[PDB]
Amino acid sequence: MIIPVRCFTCGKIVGNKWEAYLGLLQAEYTEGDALDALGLKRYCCRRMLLAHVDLIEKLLNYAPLEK
Amino acid sequence: PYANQPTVRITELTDENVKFIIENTDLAVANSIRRVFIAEVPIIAIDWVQIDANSSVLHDEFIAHRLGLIPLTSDDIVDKLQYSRDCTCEEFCPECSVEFTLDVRCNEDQTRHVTSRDLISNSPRVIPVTSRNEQDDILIVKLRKGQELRLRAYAKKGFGKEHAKWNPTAGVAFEYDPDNALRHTVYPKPEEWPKSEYSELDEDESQAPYDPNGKPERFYYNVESCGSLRPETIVLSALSGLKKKLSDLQTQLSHEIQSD
Amino acid sequence: PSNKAFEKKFRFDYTNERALRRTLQEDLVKDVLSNAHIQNELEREFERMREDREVLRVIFPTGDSKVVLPCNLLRMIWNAQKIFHINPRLPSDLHPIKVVEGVKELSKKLVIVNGDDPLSRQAQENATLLFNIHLRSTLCSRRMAEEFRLSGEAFDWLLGEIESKFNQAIAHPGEMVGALAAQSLGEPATQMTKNVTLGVPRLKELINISKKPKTPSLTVFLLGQSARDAERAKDILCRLE
Amino acid sequence: MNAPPAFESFLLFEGEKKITINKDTKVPNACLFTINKEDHTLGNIIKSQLLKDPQVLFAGYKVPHPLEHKIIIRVQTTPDYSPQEAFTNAITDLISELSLLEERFRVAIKDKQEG
Amino acid sequence: DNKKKIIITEDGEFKALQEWILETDGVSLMRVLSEKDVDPVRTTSNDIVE
Amino acid sequence: QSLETRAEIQELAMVPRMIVTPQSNRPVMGIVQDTLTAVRKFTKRDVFLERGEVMNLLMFLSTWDGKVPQPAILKPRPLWTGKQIFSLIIPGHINCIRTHSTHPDDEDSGPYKHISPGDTKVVVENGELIMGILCKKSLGTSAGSLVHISY
Amino acid sequence: AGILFEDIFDVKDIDPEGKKFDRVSRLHCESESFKMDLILDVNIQIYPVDLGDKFRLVIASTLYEDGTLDDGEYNPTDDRPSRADQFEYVMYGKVYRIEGDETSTEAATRLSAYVSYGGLLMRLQGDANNLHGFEVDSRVYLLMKKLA
Amino acid sequence: QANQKRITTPYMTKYERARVLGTRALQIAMCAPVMVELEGETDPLLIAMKELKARKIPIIIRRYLPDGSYEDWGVDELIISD
Amino acid sequence: KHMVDDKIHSRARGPIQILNRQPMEGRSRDGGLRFGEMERDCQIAHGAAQFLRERLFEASDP
RNA sequence: AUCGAGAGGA
Numbered sequence A: 001m002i003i004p005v006r007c008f009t010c011g012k013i014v015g016n017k018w019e020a021y022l023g024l025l026q027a028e029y030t031e032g033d034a035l036d037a038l039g040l041k042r043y044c045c046r047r048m049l050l051a052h053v054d055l056i057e058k059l060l061n062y063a064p065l066e067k
Numbered sequence B: 001p002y003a004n005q006p007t008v009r010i011t012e013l014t015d016e017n018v019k020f021i022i023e024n025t026d027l028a029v030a031n032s033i034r035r036v037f038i039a040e041v042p043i044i045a046i047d048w049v050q051i052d053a054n055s056s057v058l059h060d061e062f063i064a065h066r067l068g069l070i071p072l073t074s075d076d077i078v079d080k081l082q083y084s085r086d087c088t089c090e091e092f093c094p095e096c097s098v099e100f101t102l103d104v105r106c107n108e109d110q111t112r113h114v115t116s117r118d119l120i121s122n123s124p125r126v127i128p129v130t131s132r133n134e135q136d137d138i139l140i141v142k143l144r145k146g147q148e149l150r151l152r153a154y155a156k157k158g159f160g161k162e163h164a165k166w167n168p169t170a171g172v173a174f175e176y177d178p179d180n181a182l183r184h185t186v187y188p189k190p191e192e193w194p195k196s197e198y199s200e201l202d203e204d205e206s207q208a209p210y211d212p213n214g215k216p217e218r219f220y221y222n223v224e225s226c227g228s229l230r231p232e233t234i235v236l237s238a239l240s241g242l243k244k245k246l247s248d249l250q251t252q253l254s255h256e257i258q259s260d
Numbered sequence C: 001p002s003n004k005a006f007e008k009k010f011r012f013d014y015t016n017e018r019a020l021r022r023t024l025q026e027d028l029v030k031d032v033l034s035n036a037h038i039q040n041e042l043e044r045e046f047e048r049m050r051e052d053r054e055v056l057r058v059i060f061p062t063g064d065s066k067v068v069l070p071c072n073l074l075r076m077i078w079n080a081q082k083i084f085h086i087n088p089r090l091p092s093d094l095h096p097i098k099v100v101e102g103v104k105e106l107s108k109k110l111v112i113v114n115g116d117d118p119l120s121r122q123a124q125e126n127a128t129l130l131f132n133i134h135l136r137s138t139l140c141s142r143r144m145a146e147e148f149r150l151s152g153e154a155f156d157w158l159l160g161e162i163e164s165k166f167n168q169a170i171a172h173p174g175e176m177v178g179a180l181a182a183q184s185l186g187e188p189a190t191q192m193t194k195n196v197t198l199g200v201p202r203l204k205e206l207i208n209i210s211k212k213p214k215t216p217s218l219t220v221f222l223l224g225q226s227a228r229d230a231e232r233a234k235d236i237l238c239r240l241e
Numbered sequence D: 001m002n003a004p005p006a007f008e009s010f011l012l013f014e015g016e017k018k019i020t021i022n023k024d025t026k027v028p029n030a031c032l033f034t035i036n037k038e039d040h041t042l043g044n045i046i047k048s049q050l051l052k053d054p055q056v057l058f059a060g061y062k063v064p065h066p067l068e069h070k071i072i073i074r075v076q077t078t079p080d081y082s083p084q085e086a087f088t089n090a091i092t093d094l095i096s097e098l099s100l101l102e103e104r105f106r107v108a109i110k111d112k113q114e115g
Numbered sequence E: 001d002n003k004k005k006i007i008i009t010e011d012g013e014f015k016a017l018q019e020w021i022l023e024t025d026g027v028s029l030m031r032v033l034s035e036k037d038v039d040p041v042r043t044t045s046n047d048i049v050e
Numbered sequence F: 001q002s003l004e005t006r007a008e009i010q011e012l013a014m015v016p017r018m019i020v021t022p023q024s025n026r027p028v029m030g031i032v033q034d035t036l037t038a039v040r041k042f043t044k045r046d047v048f049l050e051r052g053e054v055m056n057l058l059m060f061l062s063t064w065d066g067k068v069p070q071p072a073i074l075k076p077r078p079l080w081t082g083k084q085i086f087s088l089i090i091p092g093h094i095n096c097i098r099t100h101s102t103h104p105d106d107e108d109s110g111p112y113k114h115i116s117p118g119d120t121k122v123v124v125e126n127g128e129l130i131m132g133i134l135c136k137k138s139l140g141t142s143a144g145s146l147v148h149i150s151y
Numbered sequence G: 001a002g003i004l005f006e007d008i009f010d011v012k013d014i015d016p017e018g019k020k021f022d023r024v025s026r027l028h029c030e031s032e033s034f035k036m037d038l039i040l041d042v043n044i045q046i047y048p049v050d051l052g053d054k055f056r057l058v059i060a061s062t063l064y065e066d067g068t069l070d071d072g073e074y075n076p077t078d079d080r081p082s083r084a085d086q087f088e089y090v091m092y093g094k095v096y097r098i099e100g101d102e103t104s105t106e107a108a109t110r111l112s113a114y115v116s117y118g119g120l121l122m123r124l125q126g127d128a129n130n131l132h133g134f135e136v137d138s139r140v141y142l143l144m145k146k147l148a
Numbered sequence H: 001q002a003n004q005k006r007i008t009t010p011y012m013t014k015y016e017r018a019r020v021l022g023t024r025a026l027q028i029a030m031c032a033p034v035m036v037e038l039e040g041e042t043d044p045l046l047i048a049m050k051e052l053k054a055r056k057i058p059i060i061i062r063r064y065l066p067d068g069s070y071e072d073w074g075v076d077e078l079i080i081s082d
Numbered sequence I: 001k002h003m004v005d006d007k008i009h010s011r012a013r014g015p016i017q018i019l020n021r022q023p024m025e026g027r028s029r030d031g032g033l034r035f036g037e038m039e040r041d042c043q044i045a046h047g048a049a050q051f052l053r054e055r056l057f058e059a060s061d062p
Numbered sequence J: 001a002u003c004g005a006g007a008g009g010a
């Protein structure tokens, strides 16, 4: 739903790299190139970013119950 | 009948990780040091959330847990702070916890990203690692027009043996005998295996010749830090903690012997 | 075993002086060679084994030696050898007549149907016939002397252990053998799946008597030349089909 | 519902002692040390250092159950030695080794930063 | 060997004999047994009622 | 909920008493996947355990007299074999002769019958695993196996 | 002095049927002083041997130079003079089979002793005179040392 | 039936042993005198097991034969298999 | 979706049915386990008469 | 709470 703060396997922070990863993707970078640019050397963290779907953006479409 | 005489050798020391080699020590000691790296290094982490208001798409457990996973600067205040179990004060005090406060309302049309910058603490020395003066800030939650987050948090002292959020390591690489001299691992086909980063061999050879009178020495390390502590502080604090645990065990043993 | 193999392996000898000297100690071999009562008793033991061999040939028409019997006599012999530090390369102090009387006394001690009246005596004999035949075959004097080399204390311990194990193997009153059999027959069913019906369908077909078997069949065996030659056997086939 | 508290693995329960000395009867000059709220982290190092001693005939450690939080260390020494003394000497030597390693690591860190 | 003829030779071991057998698709046991050159001791059936 | 019921269950339906089935005169329990693969690898002829390894394994032996057996190799370094440790695991003085799943059919005919080149022909004497590699056919539910002989 | 058999052997083959194990190799050795036959399992990882090597085998019922029965227990902290210090490879085991060509009448002209050093087997066969000291269920030592 | 002769087996059965142990354990737990010297035992199951091993159980087994008769055996008069 | 937390259930003298005074059904109603025909069968093969009586009479509907 | 149905687990 939202990007996890830490990698499950090793515990390295990945919750501050989703927006940068998206920017690199829009900047014509390959996915692996973006992962290397963000310093994701371990394939656990590479999985944590590459396999993430962001459902919070879809959930933000619905109007809030309380105004 | 006495102790070893180990030697350290630091190959790479950065602001994120430390590389060092420990020579002339036992495998038990090296693995114990690694285990203490992972699980017995006290750092500061949020462990008490009181959500005043939350209109976001993530529930209160979701929010709290994400806030708890956020690492905080624990370089020096971790020693002065004491565990709330041993603290003689009430539930919280300045000497056993760090205050936090979040207050964000999204009023613009653009989606509001509640990052770790919105975490405001009473302690100037205990701040989120991404807020320290590059890497971006950790996303806690996203808010649209109307949704608002209001919470209070307390950061306590603990080690990874309790929760993984108090673990200060982003990976502890451990390796001995890069060339398989001791035959600890039996390769069915040695030529299929890539050389280690610390291997000292030619390409025509796969592993070192068998050493019948050898024991694991020259243990290699790569202690990546999550930002709560510098890697040198991690290693020093882990060594001190292992020494302290052995000391308490010695005191208990002396008391038990005297009781007999 | 054949007749010659049976005689060679189970008929105690008292004519080969050197073989007897190797097999047993000096006093024992002298006594066996001298006393004729000893030889007569050993001959009677071999005669009993021959009768038991014929009875076994009758009971098992096929040469299947696998039987399910209480006491693993070979295992107890091995245990006695290990316990009493028996040396298989030296003559033993065990007397063959001590062996024979020991087997007789142990047979008297192992009882399934008690009593003295002839009906109960015959019932006990029938109930322990197979185990007694096996026990005599295993505890032969020739075998115990030339193959097992047991000592006197080893033989005594062997007899006591056999008695205790058989008394332990005797069934217990109050056992629900019917429920035991039902469960022991129903369990394989859960694991079990010309042409002949087999498996659970045939098992059901058996339990509920089926007037009309799914695959009824007759296994016909021929008596005379028909069994050997082919023309007469096909003729019989035409006669039957 | 029956999840044990997180701190149960190291926090000592009230009235429960950290260590306990029991004597082995099967062999002489042997003792059983039962340490609560400890794990392989201390067990392995204590066992190895006891194995260093030339007058320690036996040294072994075990965790009876990974759900439980106690370790058992068995030490058998020479007739002229005592398992309690062997345990104490092993702990003292481990303390000395850790102190030396920490001092040398601090020196190496200072050298690496200062160039 | 479970369906062959097992005999005892003059020397005295078990020697299986290779002889023809006939397996039928039906069941008439009394009539089959009351036949010339058919063994009435070993011929059997698999229909328990019969 | 009652003392007599507890006593009768203890005296009849205990797992140790339920080892052998009257259904097929054989053990219903044996060694299962991980321990079976591990004992097959452990009882190989080329398994050598160091001093610390042997002591650590012995810490997990309940019926241990406390005496470390003499190592099968004293020089040039003390080493214990897996068969030695399993021999000390085996209880009492039970005797057993079994066969491994890789035993050739001609081994018992030609030479080396009693000295197996392939470390087959499991033999236990006086509670000691003299030789052989163990598998299902020696630690399983088959009749005559090691566990059956032990029971 | 506790020595049962002592002779010098020459290795004639090594795994003649195939390397069944990685760290253990079968040896087919013959002697010259007593004309013996030896088949031995050796841990070649710690004690490597090759074709044509010559060594002396000393089977002993006790490792102490003076005649004193051994308890068969690990006592590393022992300072008593032992003959193990004069050899390179010693294994501890028990005799599990003795086989001979004896008949129902004649004695044994030749003999074969089977020893198990914790699964590492050894068969020594030859004349019955020099194997008379071997008994089943008895503990022996190997005490091998290569010579040039 | 004369007490001089009996046709049942002299060995206690597993069912007889289980029921005797249970009944004696219940009796002990209901404050009955003990026939053995209790070193430190405080649980009826092991107290009854000690009494059984001492062959001092005050219980008589009434083995009912199918014909309708019965033979009374004391626990001390029966061989304990286990 | 198989979380053990929704499968654990224990009973000790809870509610009973109305037609027969036997324990209820389903962990949702705090009902006990069924000691069925096969269970009584195995206990018969065991010979545990007192345990069979306790299960089918004493602990079910005295 | 009762009945019935459906979906499932071993």
Ligand SMILES: [Zn+2]
Pocket: A007, A008, A009, A010, A011, A012, A042, A043, A044, A045, A046
């Ligand atoms: Zn990772």
Ligand SMILES: [Zn+2]
Pocket: B084, B087, B088, B089, B090, B091, B092, B093, B094, B095, B096, B097
């Ligand atoms: Zn406080």
